Design a binder for these strands. Structure first.
Ligand code: MG
Length: 684
DNA sequence: TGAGGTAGTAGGTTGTATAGT
RNA sequence: UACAACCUACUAACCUC
């Protein structure tokens, strides 16, 4: 191996192997009347396990248990969606389960988790939300405190052992009223909860009215209203507070500040504490992870926790290329781009002012100078409020070779931002916005805005230097919408990643991307590779954001086999990787950690040393490229994103682009994209 | 809208098996 | 439901370049 080995700890701990009585759970038969539906079987079975109590989990069509039937509610009644059923439990003995059998250890682990939860529920000083445990004051001020603990998990090995997952976690509690909060000179919090229940509102403003005078729609005083329900007992109705239901933050509602409690944010605390942060340096997290794990092991009698370790790998550093070797995409602004064509940019200024800021102009001229490419800056002399007659100023601009526009503007309301984006997109003109109180020392901002303006004009700013198995990398994501998704793809064309492009996403009902939309988009990207390389990819790298729905790539994978194209399919989850800590030494990004076959973690980015990194968890779902070669290429693709400039995304450029793309399309809509070259990354 | 990201609180989504015969 | 993978608002926050 040409890669440097390192050992790592996972945030998992090995515990004792299950004993006989744990391997052979009480079985039970479930007799539900009226007999269940089909989509309603498991949900009711689970609500029966929960209604029977003890360490009980559903198992198949009946239930498993680590509790004696003599402490189980064997007869009962539960109310599901509309219908009221009655259940009965028939102790079918005690069959043993086998940890190798996937759904059997699925049951063993289910029971482990329920056990852990019950052991936790009985602990005295601790606060326990589900599997989260908070046990120690971490910070505090007048009226508030922050509790520290950890989220946990207990499951069963393939080899019959208990497994503990631990990750330090915090909870912010405010137990003071709004009145006191505001009386200590702090600012209004954006959200606020009822003091007498969980109902939570957005806090609009404070009221000038008198509680005892404010007539409540159909009845009494604000004060008299609340008094009625006995809420002023042991409390002091404060001032008038106008709040709103977050679902429709229009219609204001009267409330009293003595009966509201602030919902706090880290910044509401930064007014007080200032030096309080909730993320941890990785070594601190590792330490507390170990302490808490030992603490639980000691409250659990499942042995002494032995931190599980894995073999990690230092991946080769990606060689990023501008015109010359580069270390971050912003450096391309000084050295030149990987491949720059002739370009024409336009300016839309929407403050009172006029013309290109000289430093931007010079930065651009230098970059194209350095790149050995011609540049022609234009300036739109028209305003959006000229209604549509400015579309014609837009018409002019496309008839001279303008590939993208800079909008120099005051901060825009989201609505107007979209209105404008759309408006310029109709004419196939991607826009980069730059907020206009702007000064040359705000360098990372205008240089990122510039890098984005350039990606949006179709320039390739950086590429990789290296030989990778796949000559085509395409990432698939689903949706930038609520009740339905979009599902689209983006593209790193060439082994150098010499080209990036996007594909029009297609409206769909949920996560799963229709098999045929998958193959369609893929085909679009095959056409791209073909028409710039004159040949078909020998191998493609297929990437999904998140879990991959059952055989949703099947049609496309078969289409690929047919056309004699080799391929790999990787599922890239942002969650589920847990944690990774060096046994010795520092931790740098580029970490590759094999877990089972078909799966591995990748610590792709580390940079904000006040926080702890979250490895991606990746599953090799199809294909037969060595795990290490996939890791290597994913890792390098992380560095290919043009629009970030000073920090790399945690996701590989195609998946990060696909994400940005379906969020933009979900935001602006799908219309107005007919006239946009797919090489202009309009959405970064 | 500069961009990347770790941490919170409060409120949401889809995806899987699940029978009958 | 849990489990699994996610989204939104607070967040143009906070930290970092
Ligand atoms: Mg952008």
């Amino acid at each position: 191996n040409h890669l440097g080995k390192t050992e790592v700890f996972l945030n998992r701990f090995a515990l004792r192997p299950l004993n006989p009585e744990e391997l052979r759970p009480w079985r039970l038969e479930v007799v539900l009347d009226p007999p269940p539906g089909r989509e309603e079987v498991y949900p009711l079975l689970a609500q029966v396990a929960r209604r029977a109590g003890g360490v009980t989990v559903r198992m198949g069509d009946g239930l498993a248990s680590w509790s004696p039937p003599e402490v189980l509610v064997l007869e009962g009644t539960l109310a599901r969606m509309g219908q009221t059923y009655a259940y009965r439990l028939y102790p079918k003995g005690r069959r043993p389960l086998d940890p190798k059998d996937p759904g059997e250890r699925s049951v063993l682990s289910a029971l482990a988790r329920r056990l852990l939860q019950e052991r936790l529920r009985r602990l005295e000083g601790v606060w326990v939300e589900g599997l989260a445990v908070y046990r120690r004051e971490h910070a505090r001020g007048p009226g508030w405190r922050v509790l520290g603990g950890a989220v946990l998990d207990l499951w069963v090995s393939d080899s019959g052992a208990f497994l503990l997952e631990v990750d330090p976690a915090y909870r912010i509690l405010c137990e003071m009223s709004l009145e006191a909060w505001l009386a200590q000179g702090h600012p209004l919090p954006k959200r606020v909860r009822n003091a007498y229940d969980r109902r939570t509102w957005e806090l609009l403003r404070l009221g000038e009215e008198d509680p005892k005078e404010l007539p409540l729609p159909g009845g009494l005083s604000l004060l008299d209203y609340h008094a009625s329900k006995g809420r002023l007992q042991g409390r002091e109705g404060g001032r008038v507070a106008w709040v709103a239901d977050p679902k429709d933050p229009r219609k204001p509602i009267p409330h009293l500040t003595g009966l509201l409690v602030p919902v706090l944010t880290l910044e509401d605390l930064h007014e007080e504490e200032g030096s309080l942060a909730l993320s941890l340096p990785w070594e601190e997290r590792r330490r507390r992870t170990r302490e808490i794990a030992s603490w639980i092991g000691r409250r659990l009698g499942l042995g002494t926790p032995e931190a599980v370790r894995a073999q990690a790998y230092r991946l080769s550093i990606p060689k990023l290329m501008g015109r010359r070797a580069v270390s971050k995409p912003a450096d391309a602004l000084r050295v030149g781009f990987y491949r720059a064509q002739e370009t024409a940019l336009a300016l839309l200024r929407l403050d009172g002012a006029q013309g290109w800021p000289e430093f931007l102009r010079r930065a651009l001229l230098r970059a194209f100078g350095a790149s050995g490419a011609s540049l022609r800056l234009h300036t739109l002399h028209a305003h959006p409020s000229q209604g549509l007659a400015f579309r014609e100023a837009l018409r002019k601009a496309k008839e001279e070779g303008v590939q993208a526009v800079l909008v120099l503007t005051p901060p825009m309301a989201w609505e107007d931002r979209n209105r404008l984006k759309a408006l310029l997109l109709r004419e196939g003109l991607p826009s980069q916005i730059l907020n206009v109180p702007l000064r040359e020392e705000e360098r990372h901002r205008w240089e990122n805005a510039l890098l984005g303006l350039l990606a949006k004009a179709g320039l390739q700013v950086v590429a990789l230097s290296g030989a990778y198995p796949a000559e085509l990398a395409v990432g698939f994501d689903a949706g930038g919408r609520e009740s339905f998704r979009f599902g689209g793809a983006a593209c790193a064309v060439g082994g150098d990643g010499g080209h990036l492009l996007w594909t029009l996403p297609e409206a769909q009902a949920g996560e799963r991307i229709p098999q045929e939309v998958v193959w369609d988009l893929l085909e679009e990207t095959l056409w791209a590779f073909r028409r710039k390389a004159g040949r078909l990819p020998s191998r493609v790298l297929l990437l999904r954001n998140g879990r991959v729905p059952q055989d949703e790539f099947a049609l496309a994978l078969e289409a690929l086999a047919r056309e004699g194209i080799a391929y790999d399919l990787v599922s890239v989850r942002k969650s589920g990787g847990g944690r990774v800590y060096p046994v010795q030494g520092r931790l740098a990004d580029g970490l590759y950690v094999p877990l089972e076959d078909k799966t591995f973690l990748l610590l792709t980015v580390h940079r904000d040393f006040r926080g702890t990194p979250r490895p991606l968890k990746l599953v090799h779902e199809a294909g037969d490229t060595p795990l290490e070669a996939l890791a290597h290429q994913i890792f390098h693709l992380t560095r290919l994103y043009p629009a970030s400039g000073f920090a790399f995304p945690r996701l590989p450029a195609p998946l990060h682009l696909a994400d940005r793309l379906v969020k933009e399309v979900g935001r602006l809509g799908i219309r107005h994209l007919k006239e946009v070259d797919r090489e202009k990354l309009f959405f970064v």
